[model samples]
Target: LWDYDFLQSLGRHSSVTEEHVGLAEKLKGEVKSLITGPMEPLAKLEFIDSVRRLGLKYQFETEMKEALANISYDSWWVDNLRATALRFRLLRENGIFVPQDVFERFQNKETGKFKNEDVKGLLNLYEASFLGWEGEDILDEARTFSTAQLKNVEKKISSPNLAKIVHHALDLPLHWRAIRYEARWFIDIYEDEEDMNPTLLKYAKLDFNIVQSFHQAEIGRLARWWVGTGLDKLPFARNGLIQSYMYAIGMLFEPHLGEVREMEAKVGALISTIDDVYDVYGTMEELELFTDITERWDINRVDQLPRNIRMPLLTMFNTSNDIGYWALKERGFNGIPYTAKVWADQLKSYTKEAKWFHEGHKPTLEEYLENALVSIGFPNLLVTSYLLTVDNPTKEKLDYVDSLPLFVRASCILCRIINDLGTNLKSIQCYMNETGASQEVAREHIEGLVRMWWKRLNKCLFEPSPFTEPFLSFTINVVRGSHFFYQSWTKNQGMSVLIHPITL
Candidate 1:
């Protein structure tokens, strides 16, 4: 909002240089060789891991997958903690479910404690342990044991740079860190490392800058759209054009998906502003009226309503049409019904929670969670994302989303728990009021549920489903972005991710 003029200027300035492109291509080739050419399995694994962590994985995903399938890991290095943990994570995250038993060799014969003191390997094991199914006791131990060691190791480790990374990893595991944020942080960390590859660093910086240029242009267009919508003139509604844009970028950051991001950002903006109206600004009477009109989705219904309500109502109507117009034009599908349905569903949840707060009604935690999951909005976002992305969405594909599969529950519920942890008058209060638990105990229970759902996320996210990897990435990134938003990057996040580019 502060830089709308700067945004207009940015839309016109082409930032990625010709030399940047040529050099990135060259560096990309060299990195591809490191992935594909002959090397130790661990080295290749490390290369693949670096490529992923550096955010260049999308460019070389095919080569990395192929190289991974062919690469062999024999018995000699099973004792190596870093290699074993990295191998497990790379395999599991890439859709290959390798056995977690490989870590058994590192444990004590009788006591069953993992017997390793190397801080780096323990950190790797801590990250790797996160990609486990629900109730894997050994993997649970891996997380519990590794974190205990790493937390203590942080104070004892003498190297300043090593300690910095250890602290970052312990604060939030690599698995939960959002992709764009990871790329930005890791680029600087990699540059500081003792053996940082100059070629890879340069490529990472150039690639990030080019992608940042795309993000800036896309968001600038979004700003223009939001301003032109006349909803921007609403006195009470909070402006979320920038956060919505960042949310979409986290959801779908691929450059070619600009239109999808635009549409998603639009809907995201609408959902959040309406969410504010229900959560903070609107009177119960106003919200009840808005919810009724949203469910009916009739333009005529707003005649009696005030301007604040009219702005969002007509904007929602127009944007739903805009999205569906594309769907109809491209796929001969009427997306409005679907988009409207999701909006209605989300707003209903929004209205109900506000209704509970309006009265002194304190629902049970179980009852509260059922409603808050939908209120979290990830489900609505994913439904719209599926409609926006799938090349030829069949009835079955449509049915799958409608069914609200386990992965959806797993991922979206995890986000809700984070929100309850993140916001006030949320699940925490519901839990405390129902169970008569202290706030700290309620927080501990909620945090424990966060872990439980994470295992659920790890389980289903790796398994195959109707959703493509790209579409699934949207929800997964939303989960990742939630953690960053609530726990870490709360202030001026748009400036960090959208406005600033890494100096190339």
Candidate 2:
């Protein structure tokens, strides 16, 4: 009874009357609506424009908010992030320096301050001779990256309450401080403050809290969707939830500048939202709606999605793409003594571990699943522990071959796939070539075959062979261990493992 017609009648009134006010008061008590009344949609649109301008003000507020959050870390933690953030920017701001000494000097944190203060050393270059600070050089090669000026950045950061908290972290030495401070020390800076000038740490803490709160809110919705709506429709969403696991991994990816990382976080949140939409709520009906939207969804096209879905998709894609490299770089940055060479060494270690698993005997479907879970879980754990060696290093020796199970298994599986894929199974290959297969389906089949071949490899490596154990061990070890490390080894070994996949 009291619907659009009633509201429209209210809209038609020129001015509010006390008589109408009395009627509204009788119905629901003299409300502001009876006094203020409603405006036409077009007039409301002008009000909406005013609201949009307010939104821009809020966006600017949030920018300051995020910077403040980052710097609230314990001195050590904040400084390290700042140093990394600065170094990344420096590399982009200046060209990779002319001499080796210059670049290395800029990189070195021998002084508690990570800034380049060696005026004598800095003046060596013609371009840098008169340059005041480290940012004078061009980032000619790596210009695609974005970096900030240290003082301006510091000033910009320290200017706001939130930003100063982040800047406060910058004051502490970065290299060895993270382990020293507790999380609570940083958390309490805002609640009780006395002796400090309003630095960046205060703002940093707030922003950090805001981001985490935002993440928790979004994740909660996703958790419910998967549990309630999504699980029944697509049981495979358990897999999608597992894909959500990538976010924690991805957040650590790439040694992106802090600002860049913040930008990425905004985008990643949307991606998470879309993933939930597809995984949880988007059943057959939602799928059809999505399919209709696909024709319009071009990479170049603006407004590729309906307004409702656009922000989510934007966040998701920005974070999803290039997330791998981002995480890898972050890990590399965090782990000192982890140079490119060290990364390669770890790769070898990992490969060795996978090779060990690969050499294990193949089991039936039921047995393999049991073995697979343990087998998959083991090496992953090892890799994680070993990677931490970069942070919490050990002089305690590691048996590289025996402990590194995943890499060994990887090696075994890889050799077998090459062997299997190379020699035969034309029918399976036909299915593999089918372009109709979704990317997800293709990835699953490929992984399944690798797992299968991994078992075959384990059998070949570990099971008794007529050949002498020493020779067989040596032979299997070579294939399972070093074979993939070197491409030429595959060609040179003359092993059936390498040359056997298609059988042509």
Candidate 3:
């Protein structure tokens, strides 16, 4: 909680100059030519990976798409596991569907298993398997097999570069990493590569530095706003301004999303504050009153809450009104009441979990999950995200949002389970206590459930939806950021470590 001083001391970069911008734009043209120009299949693959890792792929979407589309499935075949896995991953990631059965050639038909002596392939295959959709049995087997080998290799890896790559992948899959952090990490690794291009390297470094300037400005703005709220004065509350802003970066990193990012940062800080009230500090009676106060969401009811909670409650009200005002001015729609209802439902779910904890009740896994899904606070978060980001979001889309459609449900479930794995008061513990399962068994069961939900989420992305790709990409980033936030290092050190000085 005493982190304000540390956060303030964290520095920011100056804005990139017009000359640097010109240089970057010029480099971008050179990069586009390299991507679109005729080249060997292997060279094309390496270039694609480099651009993606450099976070410059968005600058060449059409060129990359055309390049990838030119290579037919028959012509894309490779004998080795690394080439095969990389090809499959790049294709599927670009929204090109190559069948999972393409890996069958590597499998021993009689034993129905992937052949060994290909650690590089196994690792690549393991990372690629995470891109699979529901009902993809081949990918399911590939994940299991590759995971086993990767875990085994972690203890016996030889090359430093290969070891670092394996350790990174095992910590979190490439598909599930926050792109900002991924770029930061990959840039360092790319620097040491023998084949690293000087122009691309300079461009990536400049682009990242420019992006950091925008981020630092936003952080300064939000930090000032948060300081004014005086929420940090609450001794029991999570002083989460930095983490909240970092989360917003994960949600949307583009400079144009400053408004959306600001709204998200406020909500993230508010959620952390409200969560601390229910989960840590408030007594049962105090929590009941707070829940009621939130549900009422009225200025008249401010006096009903405890003195410490009143300011935050009023802040919540003001935030919603601010959001609603913008929505109406911009799109002629009133979303304050809908936003209020979302907060009410969220607090109610929080109270349900509080009661379960206080009463010493061990809920069945399904029952616990039903409430935990809402208690995780995504439905409310996603509602506000949609309201702020979507252009002219219709009642139908809002209705779909409130309904917690497949995408929402899948994302929420993934988030809850990941939090459970990382936290002390785990849902897995509750399940084990209720059913007498071993800890190993409980963890595996929960992980299986996580995988199942991920598949559903992936499917939801490809299926028809009222939401646009950018919004859907936001949902996927939520899941990615969840893993990053809940990883062992994040749990121990907090997300501030990643934000300050930019280390993942």
Candidate 4:
């Protein structure tokens, strides 16, 4: 009662001592009038004061219940919290998690929780680790894919006969898809900074050029294949395979990093040529040709491209093929022939028309065609091939999926209060890249992010029970480090963050 009266006094409504009873009567009359219909008199002061007291008591009890809950820093609890954070992060990142609740129960006042199920789901994630059915907790299990798992995969893919098995089962094309996807796993992570670090960029750019060169040649090959098949009796048609290859590569990586570099560099040369043609001195025919080379596979007619374009394209195609093949060989595959054979088999099986449908049900012809292009497309094919190679050779699949504490911690630190993934990703990147900014500014951002994270980390560690000071201190260090690294993510536009898991 005293607490409620004190709070009411803070807001301080005018009430003469002589009119105290009158004020109470007025409050009661106003409430009753409002509750019924028209013109409820103003609220009575004593009644309003008493009601406010009840509310304060209620709120205080609720807060104490949450505070008094016995949280622990147990491994199981930590794992659940971490996994929950990831699923929350992914949903938040993808723009999928938003709340429908009006009162926003899951949200904190200053802490910025929300009504989103994903957000609420995170608060209770520790409960999920043991309660869910088999394979239900994919997030909890994601931490299993760590470096230790990589060492194991390295051993498996490297086995001599592994290549033979892949060849016989999935075939080359399918193998390429798998490899491409794996490489793409690195796309969001490494592609941006792959060039930021000069040495890594050099290798990546070389691969990029070799890949592009190889890609163009394949298009030329298809045009030639039609002629060789005696289908060139008609005039040149509007399309062929080049465009499809370009589409695959483009879809795999958007915003095409390094559109400008110089001194005869691959990055420089590629971007310059693209800019010159598209942004500078381009003609209609050239534009049409470029469009044809980048969009569709109009393989219905043999006369899609003339021999001049077709044959010259093949030379580039041949060179790129050799470069990619040699690169793989250099990476320690001794039997290119065997590896190729395995990859070929994978393509046959995975892409076999009968096997290609959705869940073995036949898809519409369009879907089948789309899937065929992706499965057999150059980038996909290359990627799949690499996976088979990795499976056959390096076998170093990572298993940090189960130990996602850091990942979760990082996510919560950067995103718990912030619902927008792009914004969250951006803020973290800002913290990382602008170290030369005013110390106060940098520290302010860093400390803000850290405090946000530490709250969640504390709840994860101490909500159920108290933690030792040293352990709590350790948690602080971890949180600080996590944010420091999280800032790095903002630098290369969410790429390096994706790349090193925390470099951003």
TM-scores, all models, native as reference: 0.95, 0.21, 0.92, 0.23
Off by over 4 Å in 4: 1-313, 324-504
Query: In terms of lDDT, which candidate is strongest?
Result: 1
For model 3, residues 121-198, the per-residue Cα lDDT tens digits are 787799789988879988989998989899898878777877898889888888888777787778878887778887
Error of 4 at 154 (Å): 42
Q: In candidate 1, where is summed lDDT lowest over 10 consecutive residues?
A: 488-497
- The full ranking of all candidates by lDDT, starting with the best, is 1, 3, 2, 4
lDDT per residue (tens digit) for residues 361-404 in model 4 = 54432343233322222222223223222333432321121122
Clashes of 1: 0
The sequence of per-residue lDDT tens digits that candidate 2 reaches over residues 1-504 is: 112122223222223245643443343221222212354322222222222111111213332223322222233322332232332322221222222123333343464222422211221121122111223233211111111223234444433544444344333211111210212234343334343322223333333333333333333434343333223233222333323322221222112223332333333333344435554554444333443333233334326444444444333333333332343564442222222222233223333333434575333333333233222222322222233323323333123422434434544334433333334122134334454465457555754554344434433443343333222222233333222222233223211111111111
Question: What ranking emerges by TM-score with the best candidate at the front?
Answer: 1, 3, 4, 2
When 3 and 4 are scored with lDDT, the better candidate is 3
Candidate 1 lDDT tens digits, 20-127: 889889988887776778977877887788888888889899988888787533774587888888888888888877777877777776987776568878888898
Candidates in order: C-alpha RMSD to true structure: 1.9, 27.4, 2.9, 29.4
By summed lDDT, the worst window of 10 consecutive residues in model 4 runs over 258-267
Q: Give the distance in Å from residue 220's predicted Cα in candidate 3 to where it truly belongs.
A: 0.5
C-alpha lDDT of residue 226 in model 4: 37
